[PDB]
Subunit: 81 residues, 2 copies
């Protein structure tokens, strides 16, 4: 087949949606973490130990992946110029 | 060992990385959009390459992004 700018616009929209949904969940999780700061004392610490481990591992590994995306897209956008 | 404070700074960098990705897709989409008016008269040949490349880049990363959402969502759900 052959690709039109209209076709890419549709895919781009899906990309924005996928990226925005990720942003959404990051904000949701950071809010959760943030709300714990005031009460990070006794039983609270033990209760959320697992979630904290999971959160650290996921966020840490997803950072450079996100950075690879923006780097790739930047270079491609640069090309269009 | 892990505090909400350290998770906060990590989360901050994560927000930044995702935000920068969203910035670049906005850039690229703006470029695509601008091509539509002069498309019919343009010479597609020299655009084919970057079209194919940009299509691949987006298509391969969309499901990765969605997976990230679903994973973070499950984690944030444990918080309820």
């Amino acid at each position: 087949i052959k690709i039109t700018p209209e076709e890419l616009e549709r895919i781009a929209g899906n990309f924005k949606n996928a990226a925005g949904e990720a942003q959404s969940q990051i904000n949701r999780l950071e809010g959760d973490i943030n709300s714990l700061e005031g009460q990070w004392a006794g039983a609270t610490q033990a209760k959320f130990r697992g979630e904290f481990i999971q959160s650290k591992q996921a966020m840490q590994q997803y950072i450079p992946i996100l950075e690879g995306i923006s780097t790739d897209l930047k270079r491609i956008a640069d090309k269009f110029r």
